[PDB]
UniProtKB/Swiss-Prot annotation, chains A, B, C, D, E, F:
Effect recorded for E104A: No effect on iron binding but the oxidation rate is severely reduced
Disease: Hemochromatosis 5: A disorder of iron metabolism characterized by iron overload. Excess iron is deposited in a variety of organs leading to their failure, and resulting in serious illnesses including cirrhosis, hepatomas, diabetes, cardiomyopathy, arthritis, and hypogonadotropic hypogonadism. Severe effects of the disease usually do not appear until after decades of progressive iron loading.
Protein name, as recorded: Ferritin heavy chain
Residues annotated as binding Fe cation 2: E59, E104, Q138
Encoding gene, per UniProt annotation: FTH1
Lineage: Eukaryota, Metazoa, Chordata, Craniata, Vertebrata
Primary residence: cytoplasm
InterPro entries: Ferritin, Ferritin-like, Ferritin-like_diiron, Ferritin-like_SF, Ferritin_CS, Ferritin_DPS_dom
Residues of the site described as Essential for association with cargo receptor NCOA4: R19
Length: 173, 173, 173, 173, 173, 173
């Protein structure tokens, strides 16, 4: 049953990777939902839509890299259902950016737990993988989303509809 | 509540589109699963892996086009959970191609039902959308998968391991 | 006696680096041996020969990078005899790939021990060096060799002489 | 008061980053001082001057990267006075290179303490940042300065004025 | 003790140049502080950040040119501590621009005093240096900052958060 | 047991080739050792290091050409341990060049014995191989090393540290 390639790869690490795959796929689905909210005729913020669609595709790439890792290490991928997002209607550009920030911080927390597990199981390859490919990407994403939230709030969103319009044009365009 | 853009778009059509979105996303997940099966060190068929990953990405594009349609017509997207695929281990190149063929025929059946609904609701735009973007793509996919299954069977798959190897190289490479 | 550059570099780490240098040079010699086995007129698998010669040269580069590290840190290189490989005749493409896989896993185990030592001696530079330059390279090598072994076995090697021929052409060519 | 972006970032880490910023800015000032010493009409070693000015600019870049990190993590930058360098007159090319080596080793020691703190506070992002951007740069700098000191000493500096002249031309030019 | 190059260069002029070096380095530090304030996640004005960072680098260049002058004339550079800026938190784009304007006027006043000293000591080279390299640069800087302050005030800064956003985009971008 | 290709290839010749392979690999290891001696922070002669590393790689190529010959003729390669070099510390550029000259003359003597054996066994192909690929290369190498030794001695090495520095720059650079 043990893979010919497997070396220094704990069952707990393998399980945590499978959980992370699901979380990344979930995040991709959330961003997809947000994207198409902004594409609605009654919302009509094209650059918000583009921004979130890009994020969706990036999360899918992150999931696929974890799947690749699992196989590289001789673990076995077990997929689970991808839960639907928490909202159908994301309310506003500001509300979506705030929800994105919350999601990114949740993903980051999971990655930090995975890193801790890798370190505890003396799996330096896995720890390095997470550091190299995931942790700075998350810090950057969180900082960007925080910047966006700050700007939208300062401009008068979400009650000032001119604010979201201009942010869409000048920041996200 | 009715969208400013909505015209000649039945509630039943809107609901059927939402179901089709889920089915396309499901198909994408199935193909993703198959892809990474072929990437396993104990399977190691890189061009099978590439083939299925391409299919996964294509299905996601199909889902996104339906989401775009929903918004174009003034319907509202309601996402559902994406169910996990039926298998974790796809057994062989031949078995995966057979499962893909079955999936594609199921997707095609759903599209034919959607077309019938559009025609019944006198929605020519929707009927044309399905014909133009979906039905020939499905016929082509089904024909290709059938061709692949035929070739693999004729070559001696899945018991002849040389067969899958050579198919991977010469057909899928 | 202490180098002007030396800082946070334990004697145990210095000794472990010297051992690793020898192991890399040994691995280079093994791969060289395998290469020229495949060049024999009674074996005659040119792409196996090329594959192993490339690996030989890569291992030598790995050894030289460790020598560079030793000097960068102010340690002192002490070379030892390079032991001859365990075989003169490597039997088959499959047997050589299996022996390579075993060797790579042994090298990886040594690197993981070196990383553990670096972490225990609070030498983050050394730990990072190993992670950055060695550990993912080893995981990739192990995965590749496992893939090769799987394919050769599935094709009917080493009793099916057509298998090795075709693998040589299509995978290694 | 807590930043919206802040996650897994200890107050002690934030404080240590602020100290490191000051130390990098200090090092920049030292190198600036050395540069302009070599530009004196009674010293007149242009390539020594260029070498140290480059180092000055590099240290400033290092400080700015730490400031960027502080903000990325949601810490708050607190600047302090930049102390004047220990010397106004650096005596000789050899003496300056020796002083530079001492400075670089002091900076490295501070970075190693920061890495230890990050590891103790289970802050893998910060630890990785230091490893990736700072620790190998310091090892390289220390090795280069040691090489320069060795060459100058071997050539007969600082009593052989021809030595510094020729080193300036052939090594630093 | 007197430099071989020294001619018509008064001790008072030499001392004033040393003071000016410190003031330029101080101004560089102020602008650096302002830059990174605008990079905060709770401020998030990237083009303000860029503007001030550019100014920081320009002030450092100004300091280095004075150091070059000192050596050209046979004076001796004596560096002093670089005092920390007066604020850690610069409040707003408008407040920072106002603080910059005040700083630039203070630097200009010091340069005008230096010019007066040069003229009083019959040092035409020094007077010309200041006129050529410093005085028009200061007048231009002051005019630019005044223009920026006027525009920000007219737009409704700092209470109108849309004002700073749009200024950042359209003037500073 | 006799190779299908073997013709006019004496067992004594086959054995001598195996010995020569080992000697070339030994020489490669010696040069590698010397290279990294010059890379030490307390030696710091980069062009000496480069020179010897080049020689190391050339000797490995020479060994591989002999391995190719062995297989071309239907002999069988038998590898032996590669002995460690006689020194860990090579003392000086001059001492290393003198040791290299001694090594090259020893290698040449072995090649001349191999040529004599080939001629005695009426093996013109082998004799021609040695003449064409080895003997002029050795004469050239010996002449070059002798030239280097002469120049270093004339310049005042190894007691004049300026000599080795300048030789490193002007001859080896
Ligand atoms: Na992600
Ligand atoms: Na589809
Ligand atoms: Na290696
Ligand atoms: Na630095
Ligand atoms: Na200035
Ligand atoms: Na040779």
């Amino acid at each position: 049953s043990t893979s010919q390639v497997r070396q220094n790869y704990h069952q707990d690490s393998e399980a945590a990777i499978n959980r992370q795959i699901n979380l990344e796929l979930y995040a991709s689905y959330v961003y997809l939902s947000m994207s198409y909210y902004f594409d609605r005729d009654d919302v009509a913020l094209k650059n918000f839509a583009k921004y979130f669609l890009h994020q969706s595709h990036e999360e899918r790439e992150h999931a696929e890299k974890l799947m690749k890792l699992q196989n590289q290490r001789g673990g076995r991928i077990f997929l689970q259902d991808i839960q639907k997002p928490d909202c159908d209607d994301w309310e506003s550009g500001l509300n979506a950016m705030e929800c994105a920030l919350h999601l990114e911080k949740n993903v980051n927390q999971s990655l930090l737990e995975l890193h801790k597990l890798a370190t505890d199981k003396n799996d330096p390859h896995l720890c390095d993988f997470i550091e190299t490919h995931y942790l700075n990407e998350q810090v950057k994403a969180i900082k960007e989303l925080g910047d966006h939230v700050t700007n939208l709030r300062k401009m008068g969103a979400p009650e000032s509809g001119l604010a979201e319009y201009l942010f869409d044009k000048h920041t996200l365009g």
